Amino acid sequence: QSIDQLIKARGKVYFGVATDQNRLTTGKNAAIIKADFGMVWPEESMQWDATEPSQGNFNFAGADYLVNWAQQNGKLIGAGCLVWHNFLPSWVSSITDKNTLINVMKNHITTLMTRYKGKIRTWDVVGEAFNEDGSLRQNVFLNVIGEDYIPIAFQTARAADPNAKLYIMDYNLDSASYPKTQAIVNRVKQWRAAGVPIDGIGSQMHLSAGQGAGVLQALPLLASAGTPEVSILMLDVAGASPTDYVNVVNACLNVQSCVGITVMGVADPDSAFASSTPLLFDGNFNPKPAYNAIVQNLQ
């Protein structure tokens, strides 16, 4: 049974998965995504190095493949990350001055979002903006633009595609008692009061065994920032315990504003963390106990 169909039958928007052209042309990925998932996200093909390897020179080969595949196959699309330190070319982090970096950042946001305007559900506009203590991460954007980079990024994104949900995302937001979780909430509330159009907080849930339980209170904390939505993305769990995965699903179900859950991949051997068998399908692309437990929890 399809966990996407089942979660939609509980009133959520999707059960999604990260993928890309390289996965869709091989193995059983495409067949499983077609059958069991309702939203796809590009793992890497929309990241900065892939789409803008030098200033103003864009390419969309991978991104177009994924967006077109989704459309061809009736799947929702989320995309990102527009502004974060990962996949960031040195040409960008070598920028030393505020206005240059603002204009580079705006042009990157605008170009990517405009290309797919109206067809993308969610854009991860800003990612991994926080340190573990809740201060803002000293990536090149914070270092050079200052804290206004987050307001600017979101306002630019809203202009580029007003139909898209605009998210901030971070990891280690998995306990309500962790300073990072508290800080993103406080800062998002503030930013929204300042008119920054942050529609969602996305919790990048790369979890170790036993961490699912903490999400039951972390997720409503994230939802208390007042964004219209929250979501779970990049979900995987070391060991793929049914208990961890069911806890995450229940947190989603318990949080009105939580629209859905995206897993970081389909089958364990293709995970960057393959040896931790942290996904819902095994190396033979068969559903794992955790997949069945999610089915049972959503029936």
Residue numbers in the entry: 4 to 302
Quote what the paper states about this structure.
Here, we investigate the molecular origins of the nearly billionfold rate enhancement achieved by directed evolution of the computationally designed Kemp eliminase HG3 (7). The Kemp elimination is a well-studied model for proton transfer from carbon that has served as a benchmark for de novo design. Although the first-generation HG3 design is significantly more efficient than an “off-the-shelf” catalyst like bovine serum albumin, its specific activity was further increased 200-fold over 17 rounds of mutagenesis and screening. All HG3 variants have an inactive conformational sub-state, rooted in the original protein scaffold, which was gradually supplanted with a catalytically competent sub-state as evolution progressed.
Cryogenic structures of HG3 and HG3.7 in the absence of a ligand revealed that β-strands 6 and 7 (located adjacent to the binding pocket), adopt two distinct backbone conformations whereas only a single conformer is observed for HG3.17. Estimating the respective populations from the volumes of duplicated cross peaks shows that the inactive species comprises ~25% of the HG3 and HG3.7 samples at 25 °C, but only 5% of HG3.17. Because the sparsely populated inactive sub-state of HG3.17 was not detected in the cryogenic X-ray structure, we set up crystal screens under conditions favoring this conformation (pH 10 and 37 °C). Taken together, these data show that: (i) the HG3 variants all exhibit a slow, pre-existing equilibrium between active and inactive conformational sub-states; (ii) the last 10 rounds of directed evolution (HG3.7→G3.17) substantially reduced the population of inactive species present under ambient conditions; and (iii) moving away from the conditions employed for selection (i.e., higher temperatures or pH) increases the fraction of enzyme in the inactive state.
